[model samples]
Target: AVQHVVVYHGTLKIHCAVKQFLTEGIIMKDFSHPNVLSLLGVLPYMKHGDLRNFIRNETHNPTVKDLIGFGLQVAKGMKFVASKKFVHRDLAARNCMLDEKFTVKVADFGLARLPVKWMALESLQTQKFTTKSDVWSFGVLLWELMTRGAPPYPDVNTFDITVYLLQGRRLLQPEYCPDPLYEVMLKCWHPKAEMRPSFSELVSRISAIFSTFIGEHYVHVNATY
Candidate 1:
C-alpha cells in the first residue's frame, strides 16, 4: 500500500514497476523529492508521458534551454540520489517522466532491460556500476534530448560499442546543441572514471547553460546518425 500518499489525476495507466520495492511501498514513504516522482498510483499522472516520447513525438518549438532545464531537473534528481548515496545504474531518457507542468521527474522502476548504448566502456568491461557509470549514461540521455530520442549508435553493432567507446569516439554533437552544453555532455563520457563530473557538477554546469538560452527556442532536428 502506498502510505506516503501523493496522487495526480490523468488518463495514462502505469503499473507499479518496482522490482525490489517493499510490499509496504516504504520507499515512497521514506523518500520524496520534488524532482523524483513517487510511484503511488495506478496512474503515474504523467501528463507528458515518458521523456523519450515527449522529446520524439510531441513537443514542438522546443526551447534548447528547456532541454537544458530537463537535463538540469534530472541532474538535481541524480544529485539527490547521490546525496542519498545509492547508485542509479540507469539514467536514460526512457527512465524519465514529465508532468503537466512540463516539469521533468526522474522516475522509472525497471530492471528487465539493459542500457547498452548508454553504458560506459569500463562499466561494460568490468561488469560493475557506480554513480560514475550513471554519469556516462547521462551523457547519452543528453544526446537523446538534443536529438529527440535519436537512437544512440545507430551505426555501431550492439555490444561492440564497448570497443567503439573504448576507441575514444563519442556520439557527435547535435546540430544546434550549444557547444557549452555539448562540452558538458562530452565531459560526462570521459574515459577515465575519475575524470567524469559528479551530478552536483552537472546541475550547476547545466543550470548555468539553462540561463543563456532562456529566451531561445530549441529546434530538435529530425536527424540520422
Candidate 2:
C-alpha cells in the first residue's frame, strides 16, 4: 500500500560568486524574501537539517507531489537569486538547509565551493558563471531530490565530468522519477549554455508539474459540529 505524504513549500540560500565564499555578511542583506533565504541574526533552529539528509533519513516516504514541493521551491528561490543578477555557481540539495517548518533554505556555498558533477558543460569548458549555468546545477539538484539525496553521476569520476559532459552525456534519469521531471533535466543539461532554461523558466516548468498534483482526490468536506 502506498502511503500518503504531502509537502507544500521550501526556500533557498546563495552567495555572490566564487569568491563564492561570502562571509562579509553582505550578500544576503539584499535578499529579503522567504523564497530567498534571509539571514536573521538569531533565527529559529533548523531542526530538520539539510534537505539532502532530510530526504535520505526521512521516516515518511515522500509522495511524488512532495518531491515536487522541494524542487519547485528551490526553483522559486533560485528565480529570486537570478532576478538579483547574482550567480550561485554552487546550487545543490546538500547546500539546501531545512528548517523546523519543513521548509528548505539554500545554504552552504561557503562549503560547496568546489564540485564538478553539477556543473554545466560551458562552465567546465570556458569557466563561465551565469544564471543559466546555475540552472544546470539546479537540474542536478532536482535529480538529487528525485533520488532521495543519492550521490550524483554514480560511477563517474568527478574529474572526468568535463570531457564526459562535452561528449554529449548527462546524468541518467533516476528510478521512478516522473517523465516531465526527467525531460526538464535533459533540457537543463543541453550542451549549449544558451539552450538551458532560465531560473525563472525553471520555476514555470516545475510549477507546471506541481499544478498537475495540486487538485488530487477532490472531495467535499464539511464541519457541521
Candidate 3:
C-alpha cells in the first residue's frame, strides 16, 4: 500500500527519489525494534494488513495497556528514524503494518522529507513539517487508537482542524482515556511546537507510566466524567 498523495489533492507520482531522499540506505540496515515496523520482502498483494485493519478487526476494544504499548512502539520507531535524521512525516496507526505476533512494522515513506530541507523551509515559510509535526501526528494517532478509531476531529474539516490548532485548541479526551495518557497527548499537541516532547522524552514518559500503572500521581479534573 505504498501510496502517495500531495496536500492539494495532486496527482500521484512514482516517487523515484525515495531511495535517496527518504530511505537513505537505512531500509537495508535491519534496524529492528520491538515497536518499530520491519521491512519484509515485497509481495504481489496485501500480506499482513495495515494497522488500521488489525485494530478494527479486534472484537474487544483495546485496553489502556494496549494503547500505551502500541503508542510506545510507535515512539520507539520514530526515535530510530530521528537517529537517522529522518522524521516519519505521517506517523499514524494507518501506516503501521502488523505481523502474526502483532509487531509493528512502519510502512509508507512518500510524505517523508529530509529534516534539513524541512527546517530550511520552516525558516523561510510557515507551511512545512518538522519533527514536531510528526509528534502532532502521533498525538492524533494516540487518540484514534485509544478511542477505537474515532476520527481526530469528528465533525470538523481539515481547514477547521488547522485553524483550531493554530488557535491553540486541542482534542479533549473523553472519560475513558487515562489521565496520564491524556496529559501526554496534550504535551504532544502543544501549540508551541518546541514545547512538545521529543521521541526520546516520550519514550521515557511511557516507560514511567508502564512502571507505575497503579498510582494516580498525575490527575486531571477534566479527564474524568
Candidate 4:
C-alpha cells in the first residue's frame, strides 16, 4: 500500500538580494539536455487524481520496460531544457508524471536553476549544469523507478538517504535489475561526475541496446558489423 507521510511544509521568504544570491548561479545555467521532463498543463487537486495515485494504484507495480520508458521521457524533456542550458536541481521519480499512454512528463521546477552558457575553454572550466549532474540524478531516478516507488532506502530513515548520498554511497539496486540496464546505470552513477556520459550519449547507448525496438534511432553511429 502507498503510505503518505508529511515532511516539512514551512515556507521561507527571502529578500531580492538574498534570493538573487541564492539563485544566481542556478538561474544562469542554460537548458541543453533533451531527456529531462518539461512543464505540462496543470489542474486543481481533483482529490483522487495525481501522479502519486497513478503510479501507486492505477499501474500497481510497473515493469523494467515501464521504468525505461518513463526514464526516456524524462531524458527527452531534460534534454530539451538542457539544450537551452537549464538545469533541474531535482529529478526524482516523484516529480515525474505519467499520461494515459504511460508517457513521462517532468514537473516541479521550483528547484530548477538556469546558468550562463559559456563557450569554448571557459565551458570546460565552468561548473554549470554539466551532463555529469544530470546523469547522477538519472541513476537515482532509475533506483526509484525500479524499486516500485519504494523510498530510496525503506530500511533507513528518510534523512539518511541524503547522508548516504553525501558519503558517496548510492541506493543499491534490487536483484531484479537487468545486467545490461544495471551497467548503464553504473555508468551514470560514476563517482567522478566527469566520467558520466552526456545526454546524447546516453540516448545513443539505450537505442543501441534496444535496437530491435529502437530501429533507426539506434543507427546513429557505425552500424553493428
Per-candidate TM-score against the hidden true structure: 0.86, 0.79, 0.70, 0.59
Tell me which of candidates 1 and 3 scores higher on TM-score.
1
Tens-place lDDT per residue, model 1, 1-225, is: 444433334343444433354442555444467777765534246667789888887446677877778889999988987787767788889989998888888876422226788888887888798999899999999998988778988889986888887777999988868899899988999988899999999999898888877656756567453
lDDT of each: 0.78, 0.71, 0.59, 0.50
Residue 173 CA displacement from its true place in model 3, Å: 0.3
Compute the lDDT of residue 47 as modeled in candidate 3: 41
Error of 1 at 144 (Å): 0.8
For model 2, the local distance difference test gives 0.71
The 10-residue segment of model 3 with minimum total lDDT is 1-10
Task: Check candidate 3 and list the clashing pairs.
Answer: 37-104, 37-105, 37-106, 38-105
State candidate 4's TM-score.
0.59
Instruction: Flag regions of model 3 displaced more than 4 Å.
Output: 1-34, 40-48, 110-125, 213-225
Q: lDDT: which is higher, 2 or 4?
A: 2
